[model samples]
Every structure is written in structure tokens, then in C-alpha cells.
Target: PSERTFIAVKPDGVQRNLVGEIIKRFENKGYKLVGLKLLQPTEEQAKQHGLVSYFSSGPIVGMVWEGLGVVKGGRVLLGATNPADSLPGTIRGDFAVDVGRNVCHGSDSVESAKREIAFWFKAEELVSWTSHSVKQIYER
Candidate 1:
């Protein structure tokens, strides 16, 4: 089993209309949007995602996803680790003006994603998916 991860767009994505684009990148890459939210994050949620780590954003827009590989364990799969080296195809490499204004966020690891998801979204909020649909889409 891989992990369920969280991904988010900072206020910058809302400002830039990159939410759809961000989701599109993941979707086109064979990932499902799964749990998605476009809203102002709670203060505590913001602090958890923002205060502890390098995450920077004022009014955050957040999201959650699950994928096959474990990339940093359910934490924010941050764009542009260097901000400068972020690839041109990536949200940060193409769209970010500064790290603070970078277009999107994703869980750096499963643990981080789980924590962020609990912070931003309640358990009832997640849509349940069984293997039938999952197999139809993700696995052949």
C-alpha cells in the first residue's frame, strides 16, 4: 500500500486560477482528485501547514489525494524544493513568482498529508471509493 496524500494551492492559485490546472496536472498524470476543497483554511490548519514547515500562504486553499508511490508520506508535496529548480512543467516552475506565491502545495509525505487532511477536512467530508471504480481508472 502506498499512501493517501494531501495537496493544496496557496492563495496564489486562487489568485491565478491554477486550481483547475493543478488538478489537471495530477489527473492527467493518472491520479484522482479524490478529496478536493477550495476554501479558506481554518486558522489552526493554516498554522499547522504554515508555521511548522516552510509552507507559506495567507489564506490557504487545500486538497487531499491518494497515489501509488509514497512521496514524503502524506505531507505537502511542495512545489519547487528550491523554488528555482522547480521544473518548467511543474506548477512552481512555470507559475510561481516567488516561493510564497507558488501556485500549489501537496503533502511531502503520507504522515504530513494525513495531518494536514485532518486539520483542513473532517472525516465525513471524504468521499469513499471502492476498488471497482478505482480499478477502472487507476489500475488496469
Candidate 2:
């Protein structure tokens, strides 16, 4: 089976230029990037997520990553919301120091992943294709 998750490189992370590193981490973990784009969120969009002030301040990168359990996996890679609670190897631990400036966000559930992905991207923006490495990544 396959699954998809919504992940976002927030304003702080984008400002710090951690986009590529974030992508690399997911790629290295064998997830497929089905969607990606850089955009400035509207005030209303940010407010809807309860992050109006900070999220609307700058451009953020929105992405859809696909794999077997990427919703949970992506969250694990992102580590805790507080850098103090994050492990050294996670994105937050390595690059963030404050909860308010946590580098990124992953959808908290599969249902929310679908809703969040829809909120950030057009239906057509999500690509449907098989990765060449899928065979090696999963036993089917």
C-alpha cells in the first residue's frame, strides 16, 4: 500500500535556506516527492492554520511526499516542536532553537494530510508515478 503526507518548510526554515537539506533527508529515506512549490501564504490561509503572523511573513515551501507511512515518518524526521525535546539528528534538533521557529511541519494524521495537501496544492499538482527504487524499498 501507499500513502501521502503534507510537509511544509515554514517561513523560518525557508529564510534559513534549509529547503534543500530538508528535501535531501526525505529523499535519502526513500520517500517520493509528489508535489513541491514555493509560495507566499495569504493572511487568511495562515490564519486558518493558526499561524497567521509568522507563517504569512514570508514564502514557504509546500510539499507532498508519498510512501508507505510518510505521514508518521515525516513527523519523526521533523522531530519535536521544541528543539529541547528533539534529538540531535532530527531537522528541528539540528537547525532550530525555539518552538516558535520550528523548521517545518508535517500533518498530524492521514486524514489531515489529505486536507492539508489539498489546502496547499491544486489537485493536478500532485504527481502520480512510481519511483524506480520502490522495488528495493518495499517487499511486495
Candidate 3:
């Protein structure tokens, strides 16, 4: 059941200094951080998701999370794209007020996760290491 997904702390999130808090939530959820970096996306890179203006405006925290059902779980953790649709415990619900400034992005499906990860990270950039807590985190 192991899987991976792409998650990004958008420009607004970075500007708000919420990167560490967001990363902590993922780690607390027991997902493995396989890839992470901070970069200002080029117009072309940002345009890949049709967010060139916002995405290229500042540095973003790009990450790949690995775990069982992480593709779906990442989205749940991110909350709804429109904060109004999100529940209180979710990320957007807790931190965002508008759709245009929603603080994070998660790949919407397994297929897109694959594509997005490839778009943002080189193969070598993704580390492969088992978490010591894996035995407790997932059942065989």
C-alpha cells in the first residue's frame, strides 16, 4: 500500500512563514519526507500548473511525501482548494481565507502525483530511506 505524492507550500505560505508548521503536520501524520527543497519556480515551471503569476512570485517549498494512501491523504491534509469548503482541522481551513491565496498544493491523483514529482524533482533528489517508526506506523 505504499505510495508517494507531491505537496508544495505555495508562495503565500512561504511569505507567511508557515513552512515549518506545515512540514510538521506531515511528519506528525507519519508520512515520510522523501524529497524537499526551496526554489522560485521559473515562469515555465509555474505555468505547468497554470499558476505562473502566483507560483513564480516567490520561493516555494516543494516536497514529496511517501506512505500508504499518501496521495489522497495529502489532499485531505491540505483541505479544500477553496478554504470555505474546508473543515476546521484541515490546513486550508486553519490557515487560509481565500482560494486565490490557499497556502498549499497537493497532487490530485496518483497519476498527477507522478507527473508533478517528476516536474519538480530530479530522480536523485528523492532520497530512499526507511523510517525507524515505519513498523509502528503501518501494518504488514
Candidate 4:
């Protein structure tokens, strides 16, 4: 993993007790956690990221993970928008039941990944540094 990406554990993702599980999956895949926080995002903020809901009703854990193709990898990890369409092992496929309640939000592309992360996290919140194990995560 190389480039940076973002993941947000959605409202239901928290309610159903999937936050740790979600983060663990990424960690197992070798994505480094750079930033993390629990915040009830405003409708305006979530809307800017192309999500809408009672997002402020409950806390959503927003985080950044760094790796190659992480934006794409993150989406696969999150699963389909409609849970019914997601396959096994995906966050939505495993924990979610509704399109509206999909357990996580993963940035769709590199450009949007930067945009969305910035919406929820301040510039300084993200730390960029390769951990000692970085070399083991990628095959050259």
C-alpha cells in the first residue's frame, strides 16, 4: 500500500459494533492508520462527501489509511452500496442490511479520496510516515 485513502465507519457501523472489526481488517491488510476520530458529522459535511442521513445523530469514526490503491482497496473492503448486492467478507455484506445503513464510507477515487478526507479531517490530522513494516507489505 502507498497512496493515502479514507474510511469512515458509518452510523450503523458503530451501532452494530463493527468499528474495531473494520479497522482490524484494514490493519491486517497492511494499511497504516494515520488519522482517526469520532465525530457526529453535520448534514452539510456529510452531504459534501456525497452522503446524507441523520449523520449527526450518532458518532461516526472517520479515519485515514495509507497504501497503494487504497481508495480502490477501501471500497472493496467496504462492499457495495446496497448491502444485498455485496459479497461475503465485505463490511456491508457481513454487517449491513440496508443501502441507507451501509456500514462504512470509502472514498471512490484518488481525487475524491483527498477531497472527502479533507472534509472530515483537518490537514494536520493526517500523519504521513511509513512504519518499519512497510517494506514487508508490498512485493517488488
Model 1 spans with C-alpha error above 4 angstroms: 42-44, 50-59, 70-79, 130-140
lDDT of each: 0.62, 0.92, 0.93, 0.85
Worst 10 residues of 2 by lDDT: 46-55
Per-residue lDDT of model 1, residues 2-92, tens digit only: 3677777777677778777777776655454557766765555556554423343345566666667635522223456556777676667
Better of 2 and 4 by lDDT: 2
> What tens-digit string does per-residue lDDT give for candidate 3 at 1-140?
46899999999999999999899999999999999999998888777674678788889999999999999999999898899899988889999998989999999999999999999999999999999998899888
Ordered by TM-score, highest first, the candidates read 2, 3, 4, 1
Which of the two candidates, 1 or 4, achieves a greater TM-score against the reference?
A: 4
Regarding lDDT, does 1 or 2 come out ahead? 2
Q: Model 2 segments beyond 4 Å from truth?
A: none
Model 2: lDDT of residue 21? 98
Q: Which lDDT tens digits does candidate 2 get at residues 42-122?
A: 899988884687889999999999998899999999998788899989999899998888989999999999999999999
lDDT of prediction 1: 0.62
lDDT of 4 by residue, 107-126 (tens): 88999888878877898988
Task: Evaluate residue 26 in candidate 4 and report its C-alpha lDDT on the 0 to 100 scale.
Answer: 93
Task: Provide TM-scores for the models.
Answer: 0.76, 0.97, 0.96, 0.91
Clashing residue pairs in candidate 2, if any?
none
**Model 1 lDDT-worst window of ten:** 70-79
Please list the Cα RMSD from the true structure of every candidate, rounded to 1 decimal place.
4.0, 1.1, 1.2, 1.9
In angstroms, the error of model 3 at 61 is 0.4
